[PDB]
Design a protein around this ligand. Structure first.
Ligand SMILES: Nc1ncnc2c1ncn2[C@@H]1O[C@H](COP(=O)(O)OP(=O)(O)O)[C@@H](O)[C@H]1O
Ligand SMILES: Nc1ncnc2c1ncn2[C@@H]1O[C@H](COP(=O)(O)OP(=O)(O)O)[C@@H](O)[C@H]1O
Ligand SMILES: Nc1ncnc2c1ncn2[C@@H]1O[C@H](COP(=O)(O)OP(=O)(O)O)[C@@H](O)[C@H]1O
Ligand SMILES: [Mg+2]
Ligand SMILES: [Mg+2]
Ligand SMILES: [Mg+2]
Lengths: 356, 164, 166, 190, 190, 166
């Protein structure tokens, strides 16, 4: 009866039941192997970490079956063959992957009904909008997907390899400058917690650094799991600043504030006006306090002065892509739109292309 | 998607879009601006008889058809709309209908997702409509200039019998 | 009571009632199949636009009657069975075009009466969108109200009444 | 009125039919496939030389509005080119919907010149100033005196600033000197 | 020779100009912004679906060489996709400068298909097989017999194995049956 | 004695002497400022590449003359004052581009003679890098050797001789 929603995140798989306010199972997407513990078990244990969804596209299919089996049995604690599971895919997904996903779901778990939706259109609908470019900055990639009345333009979808993983790596690199040596995978979780709890995007990086070099009120204090109290100074705004100045990591690609402008300028000229005033942000990486103001300032610096830029950022943009799918699967009139196993048996794996 | 349209809304749209020769006493009860809602079960698009605007009353009790229409939209829920505009351009005088998609941010997500994913289920059944107006904030829909900007842009000099 | 004047031009379709100054309905006359959509919805939207009217002759008829049904129902929201329609055309026009016009107007829409005038003559009337202005100032004339070809006149005559009348 | 030749030029076709005191002349009906759409295509083709590419149909409407509200017909081509060549006194900027601005120069009067010189878009047809004279010369010899002083213009293409003056000048250049040429340019000829 | 339309398509622009026995036709000069750089961009965009990310300009040259020495144009798109779908008989490996090897499948003939179906990179322009036919149909009616049998190709983009056969087939599909189509494919057309 | 043919294309610059089959100098036409470098050194190396030529028109002139000086000195190791140069361009080209080409070639390099041909006409010559092949087979022709615009012809005419000659 109840429908499952397994969001295939690049660094966090969000799973739960349709109708809830937030996903129930949230665990990192890693498949540990010694020199096969999947998900949360790999962090506790000598293993080589592998990501099958590293860059938004499933390149290692062999581990995706184990990921989904774990998510269904040890995380959701429900049988997959008795509950329909809705799935989300990253934009610019090839047809072969879209067919393989539903083929695996229908042949391994034998779930009675499934559905594949796009993360961009779901995140856009979750903000009460149907036309507007969405900024999907996840853990592995950062996508800029301009959508028109619920139809994303695949030719203007920009993909950026800068995401929360590189931010965590840069934070690990800059924390050793003070003396805090976090090198192992266990301390990586502490660095991620520090980034989530103490980092923020500054309105003006150069001006903020001037005050941080002199004032002492900006220095915060974090409590390590072992009881030690480490202090972080100007690293609160330097870590999320990479999203706008990727020279910190070393990639030549422009920041998330310029890729958006480059993608908007690639669509139709008559729909550019509805894209500048409908910029929606999503993903866990856009949860920094003060990122919307910086994005608006940078776009207004880039965009023409005549037209106005409105940047809306919902407070639930971290799990908006999962909440959208949950609400779509919890509809009392959606039970007839699923892809039942009979239609699959008739039409092969290509049914998902016609239905979706 | 999901939610489909009922027969009453389709009949009302066919009644409003295509007008015929009518008596002067009956012509005053035509539908000027009607909203659309959801039932208890959220499975059909139904118009509410409570909030509505007649063609007869326009220019009489309702001094401004658009001004009295903004406050008619509830700010705590998502709504559809169908406004029959009578704007004057520099080039000529036109009379078209406008589809207003009202979706405030204060409404819950359950009422926003349903009305956003089923917009193609209602807009496809409304054949011949051109002017689409998507409004989320209340201040942007309250302003009078936005209707002339969406309808004809800078060309619309007068809107609803009065200049801009 | 009122009469419809429809200037089915090669690039634009000026359609409106009689007795008013400006045409209320103006849109490009193209249909677009997904690579249908008529007028402004075609202009906004992945289509392959094409003009049903060449240099005055109507090349394709299904899309022409589709545009007529559109400008009658989805643009003016009126029925053709009530108000008489007025069509325009260019001189030195093939008789097949006018015959098909009359047949489509009398069989598909079943208008009470209609008339096929000349665009230039109406544009001269407007002198005292000029073609539409002349059509609208012509439709209000009392002397012209007698020479509309009616269905009762059309039955026995067939689609050939238009040449002898207009 | 009932007497005078009509210069009807819309978006797809330009045609001329001389009409006397109620009897029109069907044997002198000229038809020219040059109209506003061809002018828009020529403007799109000649605007790429300034660095602005308009390829798609949706964009082409922007060029159409630019031609509608920024294009005019010159009294003569040569002297206006000489003024275009020297100085920017002629150039004018336009506000694009995307926010950018463009600077058009001789294109303001070069693309409307196609109405009188069809060799720009490649057509071999005589311009709108010669087809009228050839049709009147094909008409009867007693009605030419009344058709010369009555050249009724209509359509949206005849709305360029200065098209009436150039039509006049060209016709009195073609017509005999003793005949007087009048170009009725109504303000509601669109 | 002096007669025949030219299909010149380099790295940035593809343009066609029909030329008769010394007099070219400037009114039928078509220009398409689709060329080898756009093909390289499309190949980079469609190669990420296999697990190979090329983002930087320096890398993009590797994709350029891959397209130069591993890409071909199919006789028809549908049957070649059916063969691509079934079996790896089509896949071929490449030696990267870093030492790794890649396995490309349908991308060998999908990215060159953009020359005939511009809807892949988003352009609305008719493919290189339709622009030539539209320009010849815009040309004179007596020179079409000589332009149909003379389609001179040039540029590095016209060096794909099988582009001449597909150009032929498409043109005789568009042109009338009685007319014979010839595609001059010189071995030094680069 | 020999003549230089320089196909200054939008993506590549094919430059070589006359009378030979293949162009000796081939490199992308981009300049890169450190985030100058022209051609293969820019392709190997932290830069921000950009094309001075858009769709045929030369957008920026300083980098264009820089690329010309490069392909003349650091690539061919010859002086422009000795051998005449042959430039190519696309039809329906703004006259300002050709005027600036002629001015740069006659003022900065001071060539004895030059000529601005059309890329497609030369590519047809090659039929009996096709543009460069046609330019090279054209430069060896004896009849063409008379119609080069020379400095002595250029002095009184100014930069407007190119339109009337070519
Ligand atoms: N409150 C927060 N502040 C800063 N970063 C956060 C916050 N919440 C999550 N993140 C980052 O977001 C990443 C997870 O993103 P994810 O939800 O997997 O994106 P997607 O669903 O698009 O794959 C984590 O690596 C984490 O560092
Ligand atoms: N103010 C103007 N100045 C110049 N050209 C105009 C102007 N307004 C409209 N046009 C041109 O006139 C054309 C409209 O022609 P129109 O008279 O509507 O033809 P039809 O009567 O056959 O529909 C448009 O394509 C436009 O290019
Ligand atoms: N053997 C080949 N097969 C397919 N494409 C090629 C081959 N060689 C070169 N190309 C393509 O042709 C382009 C070179 O175009 P070119 O003819 O040099 O244009 P131009 O003449 O304007 O410089 C390169 O970008 C490359 O992608
Ligand atoms: Mg996500
Ligand atoms: Mg007209
Ligand atoms: Mg070339």
């Amino acid at each position: 009866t109840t429908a499952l929603v397994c969001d295939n995140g690049s660094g966090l798989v969000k799973a739960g039941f349709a109708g809830d306010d937030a996903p129930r199972a949230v665990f990192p997407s890693i498949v540990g192997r010694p020199r096969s513990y999947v998900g949360d078990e790999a962090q506790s244990k000598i293993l080589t970490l592998k990501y099958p969804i590293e860059h938004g596209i499933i390149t290692n299919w062999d581990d995706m079956e184990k990921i989904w089996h774990h998510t269904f049995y040890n995380e959701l604690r429900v049988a997959p063959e008795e509950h329909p599971t809705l799935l989300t895919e990253a934009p610019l997904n090839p047809k072969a992957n879209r067919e393989k996903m539903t083929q695996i779901m229908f042949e391994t778990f034998n779930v009675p009904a499934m559905y594949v939706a796009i993360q961009a259109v779901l995140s856009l609908y979750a903000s009460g909008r149907t036309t507007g470019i969405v900024l999907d900055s996840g853990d592995g990639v950062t996508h800029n997907v301009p959508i028109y009345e619920g139809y994303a333009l695949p030719h203007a979808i920009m993909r950026l390899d800068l995401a929360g993983r590189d931010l965590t790596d840069y934070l690990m690199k800059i924390l050793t400058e003070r003396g805090y040596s976090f090198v192992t995978t266990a301390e990586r979780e502490i660095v991620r917690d520090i980034k989530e709890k103490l980092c923020y995007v500054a309105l003006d990086f150069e001006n903020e650094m001037a005050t941080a070099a002199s004032s002492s009120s900006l220095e915060k204090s974090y409590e390590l799991p072992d009881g030690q109290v480490i202090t972080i100074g100007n690293e609160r705004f330097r870590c999320p600043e990479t999203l706008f100045q990727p020279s910190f990591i070393g990639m030549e690609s422009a920041g998330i504030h310029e890729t958006t402008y480059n993608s908007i300028m690639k669509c139709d000229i008559d729909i550019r006006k509805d894209l500048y005033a409908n910029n929606v942000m999503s993903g866990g990486t856009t949860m920094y306090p003060g990122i919307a103001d910086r994005m608006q300032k940078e776009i207004t610096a880039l965009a023409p002065s005549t037209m106005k830029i409105k940047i809306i950022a919902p407070p639930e943009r971290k799990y908006s892509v999962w909440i959208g799918g949950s609400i779509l699967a919890s509809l009392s009139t959606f039970q007839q739109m699923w892809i039942t196993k009979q239609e699959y048996d008739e039409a092969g794996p290509s049914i998902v292309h016609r239905k979706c | 998607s999901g939610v489909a349209v009922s027969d009453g809304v389709i009949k009302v749209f066919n009644d409003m879009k295509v007008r015929k020769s009518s008596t002067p006493e009956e012509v005053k009860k035509r539908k000027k601006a009607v909203l659309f809602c959801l039932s208890e079960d959220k499975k059909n698009i139904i118009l509410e008889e409570g909030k509505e605007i007649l063609v007869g009353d326009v220019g009489q009790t309702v001094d401004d058809p658009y001004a009295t229409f903004v406050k008619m939209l509830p700010d705590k829920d998502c709504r559809y709309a169908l406004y029959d505009a009578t704007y004057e351009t520099k080039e000529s005088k036109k009379e078209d209908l406008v589809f207003i998609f009202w979706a405030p941010e204060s409404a819950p997500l359950k009422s926003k997702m349903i009305y956003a994913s089923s917009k193609d289920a209602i807009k496809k059944k409304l054949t011949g409509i051109k002017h689409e107006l998507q409004a989320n904030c209340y201040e942007e829909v309250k302003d009078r200039c936005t209707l002339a900007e969406k309808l004809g842009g800078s060309a619309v000099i007068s809107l609803e019998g009065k200049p801009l």
